[PDB]
Amino acid sequence: PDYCIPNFSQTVNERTIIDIFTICRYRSPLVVFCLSHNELAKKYAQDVSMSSGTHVHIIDGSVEITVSLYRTFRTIATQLLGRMQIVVFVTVDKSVVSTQVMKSIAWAFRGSFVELRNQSVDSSTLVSKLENLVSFAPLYNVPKCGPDYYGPTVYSELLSLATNARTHWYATIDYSMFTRSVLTGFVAKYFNEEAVPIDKRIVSIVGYNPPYVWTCLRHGIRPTYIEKSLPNPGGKGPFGLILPVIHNPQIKLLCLDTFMLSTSMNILYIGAYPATHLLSLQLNGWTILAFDPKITSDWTDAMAKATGAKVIGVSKEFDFKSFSVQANQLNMFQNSKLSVIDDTWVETDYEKFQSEKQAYFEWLIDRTSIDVRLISMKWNRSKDTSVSHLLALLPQPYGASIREMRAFFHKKGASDIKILAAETEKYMDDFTAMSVSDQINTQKFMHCMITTVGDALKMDLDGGRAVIASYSLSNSSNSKERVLKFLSDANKAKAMVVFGAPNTHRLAYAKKVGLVLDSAIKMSKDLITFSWRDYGYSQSELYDAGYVEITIDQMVAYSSDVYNGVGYFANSTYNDLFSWYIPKWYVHKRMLMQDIRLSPAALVKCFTTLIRNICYVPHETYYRFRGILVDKYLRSKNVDPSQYSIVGSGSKTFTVLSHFEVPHECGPLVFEASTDVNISGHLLSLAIAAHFVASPMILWAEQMKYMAVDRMLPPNLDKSLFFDNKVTPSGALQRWHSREEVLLAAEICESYAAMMLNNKHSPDIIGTLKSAINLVFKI
Amino acid sequence: PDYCIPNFSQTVNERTIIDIFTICRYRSPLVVFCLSHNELAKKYAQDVSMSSGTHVHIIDGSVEITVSLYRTFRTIATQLLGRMQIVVFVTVDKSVVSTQVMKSIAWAFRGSFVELRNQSVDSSTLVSKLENLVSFAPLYNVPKCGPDYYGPTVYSELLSLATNARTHWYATIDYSMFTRSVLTGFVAKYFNEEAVPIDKRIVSIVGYNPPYVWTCLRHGIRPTYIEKSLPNPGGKGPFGLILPVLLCLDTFMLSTSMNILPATHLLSLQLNGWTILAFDPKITSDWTDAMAKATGAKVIGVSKELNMFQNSKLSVIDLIDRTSIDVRLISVSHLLALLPMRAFFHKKGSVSDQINTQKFMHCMITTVGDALKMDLDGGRAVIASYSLSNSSNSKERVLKFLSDANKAKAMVVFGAPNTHRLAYAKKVGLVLDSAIKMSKDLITFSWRDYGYSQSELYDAGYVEITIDQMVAYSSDVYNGVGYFANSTYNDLFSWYIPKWYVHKRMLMQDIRLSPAALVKCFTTLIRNICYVPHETYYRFRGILVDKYLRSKNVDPSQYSIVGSGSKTFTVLSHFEVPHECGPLVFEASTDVNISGHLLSLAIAAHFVASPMILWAEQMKYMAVDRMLPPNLDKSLFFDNKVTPSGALQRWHSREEVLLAAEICESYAAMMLNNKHSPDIIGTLKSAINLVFKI
Ligand SMILES: C[S@@+](CC[C@H](N)C(=O)[O-])C[C@H]1O[C@@H](n2cnc3c(N)ncnc32)[C@H](O)[C@@H]1O
Ligand SMILES: C[S@@+](CC[C@H](N)C(=O)[O-])C[C@H]1O[C@@H](n2cnc3c(N)ncnc32)[C@H](O)[C@@H]1O
């Protein structure tokens, strides 16, 4: 035993398990890099491989694209826990594999994606991104699963002695920001797929969570928050927002502008030039009337092209003394909602300028042909003044010791109020004397204006409503019985409530083996204390409530063609303790056909391969072990050994000699004489994967149940998205497995995990997965 | 607590050091597989990579052979601690790269070697060995660093339901048998290179150790044992070996005379210089041919039912004191031994415990005495494998004996526990006090040995060489076994050869003596774990040199830190740094590029035996260009630049080497989060300073 291979006994103990958790932080090694020059690709493949040992592939068209993708990514699926970078160069034309398809493939394997085909061989951008492969390996400065990144990590700093060749690295914070981005992108994908009208692209965020304003505007979605908590800001005015108690480029401007854009689809942007930060936003459905004397027709046409909003650029000064909804082209907004962003400034007579603007806005806010929702104005007043319709006067959260505030006019604002320039000087002087992280938190004063107070469990779920209930509904103030009822009702209403919660049994597994010390995180039954209390949730109870787990990887791959969020660089053990869930109705409507975006390809081989390498398990021996596990299961069911013959190969688990049946919750497992049984091996490795990271067992199981028979490919999907599965001559995705082959795998799953993890598995993880698989396959 | 990358502070603790020890058991993932059929190779490369993630290369000849080998094995060098199998297919013919060159490269990278290049596309041997690749991956059933294996592991039992698809696995026992076999093969290479006459190919095994008889006869060498403790076995006879309390006997008999009076077992031995007179009636003309060419012996088959030997000595295998023939041994008057039956005539005359009776046969080829006082004349070959390190021999006397063996140009091969490697393994908690205890250099294996260090033995005229280096160096005469797994226990020991032979035959570094398979794989592994980019690594190198020059009060305005792969720094104006080896001279307007492999070999020295001092001797020799040895295949030098003049191009200046040695303690503390061993670094540094003495 000690002196036998395969050896799980000496190789897998609690220290090995901890080491697998550790390796899981490095589980995203892939870069996919597309370019049109094969000799360049061959040079840098040689250079990175020879210096760093990066594993390199070139898809160059010597082999048909479907076959090339299949062999390349079957190989790569087994290596994703090897802690070595992997690069796939794609040098075929976009008409051979589109940008969107290759991006889908890259993100489904958790990779960075670089599209530079049809860049000239002279492109400094192409040469630079290639040299960066050799410079940074085994790291790379293009984020995994998204083009952009706005965290503190600065890759250029790793190449320079100025910071001693080191940069910041906040793995947990960056992956959480990535997670919010993806959840938003998934809602954007849902809106596209369900043909939601542009003016209904609104999501409710359960619990205040500031980054969702930016992520929503990055995808053309308007956020709104629901908070149980009464805000009580402690200022004056009807809402207490007049002086309340106290790393994107141009984040200062993004902070206010994405907030204001959240308040109306029609915007009057006074003094808008150049608003470069807007160009990264998706503003389909918005109308922006921009006034600035520096407006050119080219700025107008670039803003409209970048954002997709209908932009009217007025190259004149806006007239603050013409009190007419027919002046300043305001008539375009009659019978509609309007919000106004005033960023105007002048060196000559700045104080008088504002008194003019103030009087104009006090007039404008109260019009009746336009529903003016919110006006924001630079506020830097020397002389005292009395203000009308003032709802808020707030500091800038990214203002950082600066004179100027931001005044907010509203129809529900303070009718009149005396704003003493001695207190606005004091208030700003205190505010100048605070930390960056304190003052940034004052953005909650802005965001309460787009916050509804109420109990999200009581919200109206009508109309296919989109809701992101990230961590919030799992807080122990919401009882599990009420949340499961809510979610069940949400699925029945065919709403889109996206739900996240700590994963009970994975959190418990991580405690039990000594990863988390039982200090930084602690639990008792399903109640969990983080360092606040949430309830953990598991897949069986949620599947009963009509919810199916999907991983974050699957969500961003599925949404790849609308995604406009951030990527990430490292995985994070903390984030991996959570699971995310979507309603069953949407899975069955749109996700039963498993193209690579919804595949668990990047999970089903990498853990098994790592364990076989550690434990000296030969390829064919693995399949022998599987047949032996089946043998012991059938024996334990008093099946007569005479009726079957174990084969134990990749293509045949066993052969049925004579007819027999095994009693099973879902109805007996029927084995007909003289048939070959090939059990569903991916169920077994997904059960191992579920010990360490979110593992999409039930999404795969629903897909697997659907693939009891052949299914025609969907007509509006590039067929290369199906490269990883057999497609019949007729164009049907070929069937996968019978119910017996899947439920048999579920029946031996406990003994498999015990074998592969030296009885140091979690029987609780297995049982909740087994139970939910039986639910998928119920009579 | 740090939120920065690179990160050693949260990533490298004592448990990380333990895991690296564990990964070193998997450090031989390579298989080198030669065949003539490229579409064949492409098919099985796809099969094994797609199913098990094996990394596959195909050297097919679309790129010139020297370049292909260089690119392939520079890549592989970085990957040897990845715990994933690596397969290199070679499909060019033997006139592009020979069997012997490819075998030498394979074993220099701790690989399995398969040569099937002239088999046809559906040869069943070829097709089977290719499917074995898919079936067994990540393992493979052809041993590493040797064609044969005779341990308890049986690979077919992995594919059998009846045995529960498991087999025996005795890593330390198998690596010890591999080690004995390689030491023997190295003595065989040494006899070859020294043109030692065939009648003089005799090795003294210090300490009784049974497998050496078979390994010696596998290489045409006769063994003799030297033992200090050998008390009476309790028999009647002047040797006391009568009644004391197949391949085996013949190899023992063959040890006792170059003239000897089916025998299918004898076919695998090497018996050049032996003359066999064979008695049986079954003898056919072909069998004598087969025996002669297989074993290289002069054999005559009588085909029936004796003064070739009037000049010589003779032994006979089933009267004695003739004056014409000196009958050495025959297998009652003049009887020497009767053992478990079988009789032995001499002028001067439970199943596990039955095998240990071979101790009674080997007594007759055993000389009693203290090996520390033996005669060292003649370039005598001696294998002091795990014997002279025993604490009964004192360190002063052993180091004296080794010192004098080197002066005398003897070939005494010495092995000993590595003090500071062992101490490190215990300090981080790998080796438990239960198993091995240590007080200074005295070690208790739970017998007691003294540990030795590399500086000690270099002071005594000895140079460490690794097992991997010995078997690769000896690849063209090797006839021993390979291994399947590495073993922590075996890695705790270091092996040393005398300085005189190193300087005479080992200063020219072809791949067989390269540290290629150690200089990148630890570094690459640590960079992966600790998030160290490729360029950043050379930035860190620049920082360490800068901190060092400042600690020596070098004026920083006299140099510019570059921190790249090709320039560590540039000298702006002349300066000099005092050093025990003579000042380090830095001239204006030149570029300095320190020898980074010193730093990586010091890291490797924490975990496994080190080729550091052999590398340093070669590095010293390579201060200038050196013409290639005329009778070596050119491709063996693929890993180093060769001049148009036909010379191996010079490597580094003494400044570049000693600067590396000077920053070596700071490099190891950086890469191991201060969890390194200052003593390992210290013994390597003082040794390197001795290699480069004034
Ligand atoms: C965004 S995190 C806040 C974490 C931190 N411990 C705190 O309270 O500020 C969870 C938020 O969601 C809110 N939340 C939880 N359940 C809710 C529900 N059923 N309806 C509305 N808000 C809810 C909580 O009040 C909390 O503010
Ligand atoms: C603070 S900068 C605006 C920057 C812009 N908000 C952005 O995000 O990049 C001041 C701008 O106000 C404009 N401005 C000043 N008076 C104006 C007026 N009466 N009408 C329109 N624009 C005015 C100037 O042309 C100038 O472009």
Ligand SMILES: C[S@@+](CC[C@H](N)C(=O)[O-])C[C@H]1O[C@@H](n2cnc3c(N)ncnc32)[C@H](O)[C@@H]1O
């Ligand atoms: C550490 S033991 C290992 C051999 C064997 N495995 C055993 O258990 O004894 C080394 C052997 O070599 C012998 N030996 C040690 N030093 C010797 C010397 N200087 N001359 C001859 N024999 C020596 C010892 O008597 C001992 O039997």
